[PDB]
Write a protein that binds this DNA or RNA. Structure first.
Ligand SMILES: Nc1nc2c(ncn2[C@@H]2O[C@H](COP(=O)(O)OP(=O)(O)OP(=O)(O)O)[C@@H](O)[C@H]2O)c(=O)[nH]1
Ligand SMILES: Nc1nc2c(ncn2[C@@H]2O[C@H](COP(=O)(O)OP(=O)(O)OP(=O)(O)O)[C@@H](O)[C@H]2O)c(=O)[nH]1
Ligand SMILES: Nc1nc2c(ncn2[C@@H]2O[C@H](COP(=O)(O)OP(=O)(O)OP(=O)(O)O)[C@@H](O)[C@H]2O)c(=O)[nH]1
Ligand SMILES: Nc1nc2c(ncn2[C@@H]2O[C@H](COP(=O)(O)OP(=O)(O)OP(=O)(O)O)[C@@H](O)[C@H]2O)c(=O)[nH]1
Ligand SMILES: [Mg+2]
Ligand SMILES: [Mg+2]
Ligand SMILES: [Zn+2]
Ligand SMILES: [Zn+2]
Lengths: 351, 346
DNA sequence: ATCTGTACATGTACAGAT
DNA sequence: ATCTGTACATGTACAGAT
DNA sequence: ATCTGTACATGTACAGAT
DNA sequence: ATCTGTACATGTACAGAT
């Protein structure tokens, strides 16, 4: 009932060292070769540095090591941003210059830069004979260049081109990241001293803010006590709750295409808010994993029904606004969550 | 009570402003001089350390601690006679070498000479250079705002540099600040100041590590921040420093004791009692009293290990005579059992 | 001769294996 | 409870450039 | 190789609220 | 007496300019 059953699900979700080892060896080979090709010659992307992000590098990837996220980030000095129609997250970017090939009268085209980035990667991937690796068909309005690796087992790698700016963060984030009562003001001041990132979303010239680096730090430094989850401190169940929520969404999403609008970033955003609401490490005791997961489920259901889930970093941006996800989709997911909740999570046994 | 003592010890905003603006004028000018030359100390950077910059200075802003740190390349250390804290150094600076050995005395002397020269050229501030104490690592400036202000200018070598093996068991913050903090702190450089054990020796300095700890001292990240709870850790350090300053004023028998003994002791207490709730402001009396008992127990056992170099006993019979320690135990036991009368004398 | 972008060397938190 | 592979931060060597 | 500009932590000082 | 909110002050990390 309480602690158990969910501990059994977590056992299923745990990655195996052997799988991790084989997956990481291939992924690192491909990524380091693509990073090297970016440094060659008159490449506009010379200087890009690598930044590993997403669930695998936060240690909340579940089931298999089959999806990796890596940012190829390019420091770009004197830039001026114009917010795209008070949306908070989307921007136009303006200013001998290797990026002039993508300029458009002051304005740096996102899809032109991404196309050349994409073109380079496809070419370098053709020269790989070690590995069975190809490039996925492009999704319109997607920042990523996704590699598909057959190791025999299947592995996705989303390479995200990112602009790196070191100025202070855009005003729309000033009230975001409300970690003052949880990680504190010094951590917040230091995190906002780090660069911010822009990824390719006036349709084709817009960029979107990314905070994958800040999210990575928070996930690996998630406690009010510095010793949380350390070898001389107490274990918490924050990440374990994130895993169970991720797994509930993944299971439901591979069954019902009604849920196409939903994604793991909604789960990640919601639990960041829960962690803020419940800052104390004792509110995430491993013994109370059932209650901790249940109160996360209830908070997510409230967000669905009230149609309100604010971006953790950009408070005026509501990821559940009617313009992004239709009410019926949200009602559909509310019922499937409430059902799983009241019937012993039968979907955790599925497959 | 103890609150009233802390109100007396609080520095005044006005005095801080006047003293800092004078001190910064002098320090800036000396630092410029070390850069602008064929100076062999070209490259020194400033690092503000000690109680004023840790926010545990008491009574008046009349003592300032500044390191001019100089990054040096491939240096090898040899530990001086198993002491832990004292090293010979080996491999611009050729003017201070010996037989492969970089001389603390010879480098300090030139450092000292340059500073005294620049001080002669200062005609807007009343500022002299105190007579040198043998063995000491400091160049001390005496400023008269009109009030008296001390500035200890400490030359420091910077290496980076796995910390020397004598510190491997040091800094035992794992259950308090944690392993990530400890690992990151020990990724910082380590420092060497020209305190002689004789003439060629340097001593390990961890002033940059103690500063981080003083300002990052809670088990909770929010300790003492605007969205956290206040603790009484620093106020306990202030009262313990005040007890010792007042006792040292009065008895020359305590000349061998210094505020760093108190700082070392409270680092150990803070490790013993990591929880922030064990330093609740409402328990200021219990907290000060358990700090008193811990310090007495150190005196009674003649054992107070360097927080960063655990084999180095600051209370060894070699460093402080048994009689001095018994004298300080009786005077502390006395103040304790009579309501600290020494806190009432201005 | 000296300089330097790249990659190795070192150390350890995290978390899976045992 | 201990042992151990990956990721990562920082320090340092050096073939190839200068 | 040096310096200002910016942002906010750490303080002190004091009135009004509690 | 203590707490909370605002005003006032210094110290410090680091971006951007030079
Ligand atoms: C802002 N950031 C996003 C969005 N989607 C993804 N990200 C960021 O991109 C990272 C990787 O994306 P995903 O692979 O889709 O999600 P994940 O965090 O790695 O979790 P998984 O489903 O296990 O892969 C996330 O951790 C986020 O930081 C979004 O819609 N808005
Ligand atoms: N590391 C990182 N990866 C990102 C980020 N944003 C997107 N990605 C990757 O790119 C994938 C596609 O991003 P999205 O466009 O937001 O996801 P989507 O499935 O296309 O959903 P929508 O575009 O919102 O309709 C994500 O799943 C991530 O793997 C980011 O900010 N950081
Ligand atoms: C190692 N470091 C020392 C020793 N003495 C002083 N220090 C360091 O130098 C700093 C400044 O020393 P002091 O001015 O004498 O003491 P303080 O900490 O500033 O405290 P005050 O008495 O208020 O001046 C200390 O905080 C220590 O980090 C010592 O004996 N061994
Ligand atoms: N910032 C800093 N200052 C130091 C350090 N060590 C010494 N000092 C300063 O130099 C002063 C004299 O240092 P001491 O360690 O007392 O040397 P000493 O007076 O010759 O020897 P003692 O008799 O043991 O006191 C201290 O009061 C500090 O102000 C250090 O490691 N860092
Ligand atoms: Mg992912
Ligand atoms: Mg001092
Ligand atoms: Zn934890
Ligand atoms: Zn505190």
């Amino acid at each position: 009932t309480g602690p158990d059953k969910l501990k059994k699900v977590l056992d299923k979700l745990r990655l195996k060292r052997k799988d991790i080892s084989e997956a990481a060896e291939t992924v690192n080979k491909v990524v380091e070769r693509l990073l090297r090709r970016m440094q060659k010659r008159e490449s506009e992307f010379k200087g890009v540095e690598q930044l590993n992000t997403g669930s695998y590098y936060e240690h909340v990837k579940i089931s298999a090591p089959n999806q990796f996220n890596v940012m190829f980030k390019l420091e770009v000095p004197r830039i001026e941003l114009q917010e795209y129609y008070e949306t908070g997250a989307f921007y136009l970017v303006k200013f001998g210059n290797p990026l002039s090939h993508f300029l458009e009268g002051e304005v740096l085209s996102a899809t032109k830069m991404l196309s050349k980035f994409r073109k380079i990667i496809k070419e370098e991937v053709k020269e790989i004979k070690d590995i069975d690796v190809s490039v996925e068909k492009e999704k319109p309005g997607s920042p990523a260049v996704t590699l598909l690796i057959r190791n025999p087992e299947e592995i996705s790698v989303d390479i995200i081109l990112a602009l790196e700016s070191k100025g202070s963060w855009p005003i729309s984030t000033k009230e975001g990241l409300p970690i003052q009562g949880w990680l504190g003001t010094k951590v917040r001041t230091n995190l906002r001293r780090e660069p911010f990132y822009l990824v390719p979303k006036f349709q084709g010239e817009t960029w979107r803010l990314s905070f994958s680096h800040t999210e990575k730090y928070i996930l690996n430094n998630h406690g009010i006590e510095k010793t949380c989850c350390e070898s001389s401190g107490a274990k918490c169940c924050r990440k374990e709750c994130l895993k169970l929520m991720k797994y509930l969404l993944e299971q439901l999403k591979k069954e019902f295409q009604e849920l196409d609008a939903f994604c793991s970033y909604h789960v990640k955003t919601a639990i960041f808010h829960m962690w803020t609401q419940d800052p104390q490490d004792s509110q995430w005791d491993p013994r109370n994993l059932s209650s901790c997961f249940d109160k996360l489920l209830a908070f997510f259901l409230e967000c669905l029904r009230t149609e309100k889930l604010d971006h953790y970093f950009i408070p005026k941006f509501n990821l559940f606004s009617q313009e992004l996800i239709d009410r019926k989709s949200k009602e559909f997911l509310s019922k499937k969550i409430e059902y799983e909740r009241n019937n012993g999570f039968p979907i955790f046994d599925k497959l």
